[PDB]
């Protein structure tokens, strides 16, 4: 079990850790989060009490280093840092643990939610989407735009999601225009899976990471990316059977976790209705269709 200590909490803030969140008051004696499950990526995120604008946060994996959060009064935000002195880090974590100034990662034993949301998400792939190679953790916020969005302005602060575009030469083989546009299997299986992602695990990891950035930060380009990756599978007539079954599980947990009040902005009516009722895969997403119909029948 791992620990992300905090220098202090000088400003009132709502702190998220994965799907959990708690309120910290201005200058409350808060010194971090303990008992964080090893083996998964995690995200620690922030919304200031004075500015519900800019949700922001850090993707990290405690196996890759000892990390802590400190508020920067110049840049006005909680920053993740790495302490490379392991002695000093255990020594500081034990002090705050003894004084019981840490919240415990509040996982219920039966509860596989976070695993199910991050099953294919790898820190090394996150760090290629979010390019800042001097750090081992990755910053994301509500406003960051995607490479594809930048094409349609600061490239250093972009989300380098894999560009998907259904009306592009990459997607459409000369002489197979109608075929490749109505049945995207070539684009999914040869261009993206074999060519770019290499395997379905890396594809699902990017899909899950895009969903989570859309949910935790309201990141609009991430939402676009998540729906595009769903639509590409659903609009392919030929998809490995293992991928369809896993996609159904992935989406089920995503829909389950989505805040009920955010369904209006985070769910694209067209994509979902196409995917569940018109696409080749309309009969292949039984769990996802059932939770969608029982939880968001309005969208459909």
């Amino acid at each position: 079990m791992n620990t992300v200590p905090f220098t202090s909490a000088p400003i009132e803030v709502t702190i998220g850790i994965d799907q959990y969140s708690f309120n910290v008051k201005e200058n409350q004696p808060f010194h971090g989060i303990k008992d964080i499950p090893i083996g998964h990526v995690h995200v620690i995120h922030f919304q200031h009490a004075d500015n519900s604008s800019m949700r922001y946060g850090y993707w990290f994996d405690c196996r890759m280093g000892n990390f802590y959060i400190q508020y920067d009064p110049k840049d006005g935000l909680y920053k993740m840092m790495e302490e490379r002195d392991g002695a000093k880090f255990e020594n500081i974590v034990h002090n705050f643990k003894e004084r019981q100034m840490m919240v415990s990662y509040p996982k219920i034993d039966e509860d596989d939610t976070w695993y199910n949301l991050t099953e294919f998400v790898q820190m090394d792939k996150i760090r290629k989407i979010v390019r800042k190679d001097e750090n081992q953790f990755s910053y994301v916020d509500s406003s960051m735009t995607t490479v594809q969005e930048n094409e349609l302005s600061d490239p250093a602060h972009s989300l380098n999601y894999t560009v998907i575009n259904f009306k592009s030469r990459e997607a459409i083989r000369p002489g197979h225009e109608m075929e490749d546009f109505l049945d995207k299997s070539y684009y999914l299986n040869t261009v993206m899976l074999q060519g770019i992602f290499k395997n379905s695990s890396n594809y699902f990891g990017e899909l899950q990471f895009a969903f989570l950035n859309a949910m935790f930060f309201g990141n609009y380009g991430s939402s676009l990316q998540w729906h595009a990756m769903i639509e590409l599978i659903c609009s392919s007539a030929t998809v490995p059977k293992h991928m369809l079954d896993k996609l159904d599980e992935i989406l089920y947990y995503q829909i389950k976790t989505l805040p009920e009040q955010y369904s209006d902005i985070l769910l694209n009516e067209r994509v979902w209705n196409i995917c569940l009722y018109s696409s080749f895969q309309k009969n292949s997403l039984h769990n996802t269709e059932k939770i969608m119909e029982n939880k968001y029948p309005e969208l459909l």
Partner: protein, 237 residues
């Protein structure tokens, strides 16, 4: 963006553009079978691709053999239309290729866009105008070449005949759409109007009769009367 009443004179500027109408690409007769079921029989069709500034009409004849063994023909017809328009553009010298293609039905946008991915700088546009190009098969010489074709064929026409020698392209297009609107609303009446006077003939190299300027004013007035009446006859007014 979409072409409408407000950006209408853009049709007659010096940027090369084409209207594409697909309404006569896939044409059928519906009939009863011996068992009393219904079946369709395809007849020859055509793509109607028109330069509204010059009157040049690229009539790509669609022979019924192109549908043999194919499914979902109405969907295929849109893609076939886009394939043929893209081949037309590629066949033209660069300086004759259009800057814009305006489709008369929105369902043509994605097929044409996908077929024209090689031409990122050609704008594919819809229109809010309700253009009467479906009535192109009411022009006898166009119907004739479509129905006689035994194989795929492109035939080139000037749909304005020699009118541009005397009128502007705005006026020529207005006359064309009035004639076609009239033929669409009441083909028999419209065709009676055009031919009632046997002394005014159609030149071998033309589609419409050789009216004088004054006779065109009378004809045009008769077409407007026809259209207004049918509008009454139809809505009772």
């Amino acid at each position: 963006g979409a072409m409408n009443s407000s950006n209408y004179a853009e049709l007659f500027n010096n940027d090369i553009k084409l209207f594409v109408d697909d309404t006569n690409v896939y044409r059928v007769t519906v009939h009863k079978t011996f068992e009393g079921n219904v079946a369709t029989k395809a007849i020859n069709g055509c793509i109607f691709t028109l330069n509204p500034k010059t009157g040049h009409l690229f009539l790509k004849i669609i022979h019924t053999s192109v549908w043999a063994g194919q499914k979902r023909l109405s969907q295929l017809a849109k893609w076939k239309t886009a394939e043929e328009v893209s081949a037309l553009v590629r066949s033209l010298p660069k300086e004759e290729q259009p800057k814009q293609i305006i489709v008369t039905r929105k369902a043509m946008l994605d097929p044409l866009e996908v077929h024209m991915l090689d031409f990122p700088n050609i704008a594919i546009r819809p229109t809010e105008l309700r253009l009467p190009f479906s009535a192109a098969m009411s022009i006898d010489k166009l119907s004739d070449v479509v129905m006689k074709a035994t194989e795929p064929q492109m035939v080139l026409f000037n749909i304005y005949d020699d009118w541009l020698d005397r009128i502007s392209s705005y006026t020529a297009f207005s006359r064309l759409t009035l004639l076609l609107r009239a033929l669409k609303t009441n083909e028999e009446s419209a065709k009676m109007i055009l031919l009632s006077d046997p002394t005014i003939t159609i030149k071998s190299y033309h589609l419409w009769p050789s009216f004088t300027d004054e006779q065109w004013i009378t004809i045009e007035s008769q077409m407007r009367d026809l259209i207004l009446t049918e509008y009454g006859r139809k809505y009772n007014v």
